[PDB]
């Protein structure tokens, strides 16, 4: 449903007002979804769409992108924007982020390192360890990831995320901060930059 | 010289093409000089394939035992490690290119082909040698070139060999060894037979003012990422594969030496399974050199960064 | 921040005294501030020192050179903080601990921050990481914080010598590493040279 | 059927030309090779189809080449 | 020249050396054959990502002179545009280059024709008559500027940068060095380690510029600052890059594997000379 | 026999002709067809192929459709609800009735293999409770499953745990070095023994 609404909002033979209601509607179907790539990835797409800033769910949107915790006042309002059939619940159904942010963060994390505990992963995605463990398992099972779990020492080992690459990538980070420092030095005072370069050519 | 090399001479090629010395000897050539252009274009095109094979063409000339590679251009053709004489599909695009090239003022004839073997080394396969052997009859002059665009980033050394192969039923000499970049488990066999059929040629260069430098300066920042190659995990699959195959060869060696080659007033002559340990020792070296090369990427980090601590 | 700093200096330079006193209380409250260099160095703030608003610079000092344990210690002499000001100092204690040890255990963090539990403590480091002023990850297995990255605020101009010493140790060993590799490459080369020599030498005599 | 053969012939030409440049004789033979199972097309028919294809701009002739066509998208 | 001489525009261009070696080579060929030096005008391709431009590659175009004006042939370009786009479609058309000394009207005439392909093309000009040691390529964009109330196409100059492509760089190393093999074949250790060597040498040079800056801000000659010192302070503190109990064993586990691997190879090598020694000995001292 | 697949195709092939003649046999044949399709494990099609389009609406055949949907999703709670609710239409026919115990085991066995994956320590009373049977039949299922290797791991019966296996690392490097290491011993013995 979310895809369909989103596509309508991108058409130019769709009336103006209705493009935005449709975007509003897309956001709401995207927020209710479960398991997989789409809920945080559509939130990011939606955030880049400048039209969401005319919406009242803009708050939830900006707060999710900037990774700011959600509170009671905002759930009450969102629940009220919902059409009656869309008040669809698991007996507590709400706005809960999770399916791209777990999945997207696991994909960003494979590019960041080697292997990790559940405690750290649960604490980082702000969910219980079991939910992470459940979605990680699903992702390994669907072959969109691979790994094995050590539940004796409470650690999942992944085809990349949090270990020997962390060491390698920290060397890269440190050396990039060195480059950054060289850029900042060139910006404030180019005089010392030229002068101190000639000091290397003397040695 | 430096400028004499840059000009092309149509007449020098006309004499050479009439004379046709290569019919006498196909091991004739010995040096290469490849343009800075030829090389950069060849690496970038190879890299655009990914880890998937691509072919391009080279324009050049020959002068004595030197081959000269003036320019190169890419082809959008698929058939490097499957289709025998993949180049044919490319012919229409080549005919266009040479015609377009002549009119701006580049008149130099096609010297040969380039392809690439990504993540398995610089060597010619069964498809490649078979396509070259037709080209040395028909296409002349025609030379094979191989480059790897992933291996190269780690080592910092350009692996580029321009080769030529010998025609069928030609006895190789004692010219064995070359650069050691590991092969996968089933590709090991294929190298083993083909290597003596060809030779690599040594390479020179020259330089001036738009492409080189964005790269040279960028390396001044960039240098950190090449030391975090960390091969041992990236191509973990290579070690297990070669070592299980090396074991099968030692079983072959135990029998070969053990029973002996059956011979009655005949003594072994050149073969790719003649003196099994002598072959085998070298296969151990291509797997060992890569492994320790992996250790050396690790050793550098450990000494340079980690020993500093906080004083 | 970025933008907000460029506004505040101009405003400080613009006014005097009674407004400057006010501005200190606002800078510390204002979000995205996890720097407190630039305003201190201006002449304008400096006048309030040695008077009845001296305590405001003395606190600003305490944030700049010091931390949460240095604060509590003279809690009486300095005027109050609000929740945003305290939470900013508490994140700013983690950067300091990170200056000494790369990995800092919970019992150290816990004492210094004077926090009620582990979960309240672990919430503060996740909030920092989203704003990206500190980068780092929690290890609940060994009970450490392992920091990826951290940034100063830390003027600390007496202690600066340490930073020069470490930069200097980083220097001297470099050359010790280069003479290093230069040696090995020549030793590889020396071996191949002799090996080529001996074989060619031996082969000739077979002919006789 | 006659009209139908033209379309199939055309489909064959585009299909073959997609799989880039071919000489006229080669193209025709392939059309026959492909179409053999269904029926043997008349040579005259093929040529007409090729021209139609060019107008449709499915395939173009090489600028300087004796009977050569390139697949143009 | 003929130039507006305005403020630097909204795009940046980055500059770097082999392609002009391609141009020079042609120029030498052409000069020898005709009997006079002949310029070439050509296209640029590269990329743009944002407002910043990386000029990655180039190719020569065909041209003719009728009057004192240059006309680039369109039919030629459109044929070469369809072949090149098949292989490189990631890259796109930036503009052109020409040859000569300071800016002149005959460049502005040709730049209007290029405006037909893309509405905003870049202009680039190389003097191979340069008496100067700095890089003698200068980059321009065209601005439409009003002078004496009449709108005139006038050029504005851009500054440059250096950028990516490690895959390409390793070839620029080989190209640059032009070194020959010694007595052997060149060693495996030698060939492997060069990047590693040069990498250390970059860190020597990186430490040096930061260090002399920090001292300068204390000493005088650079003033005191907070933004740069807080960051340098922080840069020191991160070292050493892990010390955890978790890292140590996994680091050694890989070191230990490559320690056995090496041992099993040095024995295989020794076995070979043993089989060779035993073969030659039995023939000579015994009867085998 | 065990050749569930040969049954499916013969009943499927038969149904078309049974449509032409018609009733009553179409109703009974349809039970034989659904039964057979389940046992193959799995490639289910008693309903994306062709067999009964207006007749399926009658509640008699209806049970079967629902029962098959519960088998394909492999959900225990629905299967057992149908067996109880529409008791007569499945239970009265003796052929189908015979396999039913096996079908129950089949669902529980697939459900177990899905479940197992988030853990590396899972308790036997926890899985018995989840499957809806006592500890002893689950214990007996596990033993047979490890030997068939449709569950990976071993049991700790002095603490009631499954030490599932995810204790893998590499191994592939370490075994190839062992094969390499054994040939070098035989090779040294061989070469040195050639001397005199």
Numbering used by the authors:
A (entry chain D): 204 to 406
B (entry chain E): 24 to 334
C (entry chain G): 8 to 215
D (entry chain O): 672 to 690, 692 to 745
E (entry chain F): 29 to 316
F (entry chain B): 248 to 443
Q: What is the paper's account of this structure, in its own sentences?
A:
The CRL2 E3 ligase consists of a Cullin 2 (CUL2) scaffold in association with a catalytic RING-box protein (RBX1), with the substrate adaptors Elongin B (ELOB) and C (ELOC) at its N-terminal. When associated with the von Hippel–Lindau (VHL) tumour suppressor substrate receptor, the CRL2 complex is the primary regulator of the Hypoxia Inducible Factor 1-α (HIF-1α) transcription factor. Activation of CRL2, in common with other members of the CRL family, involves a cascade of E1, E2 and E3 enzymes, which conjugate the ubiquitin-like protein NEDD8 (N8) to residue K689 on the CUL2 scaffold. CSN5 is responsible for the deneddylase activity of the CSN.
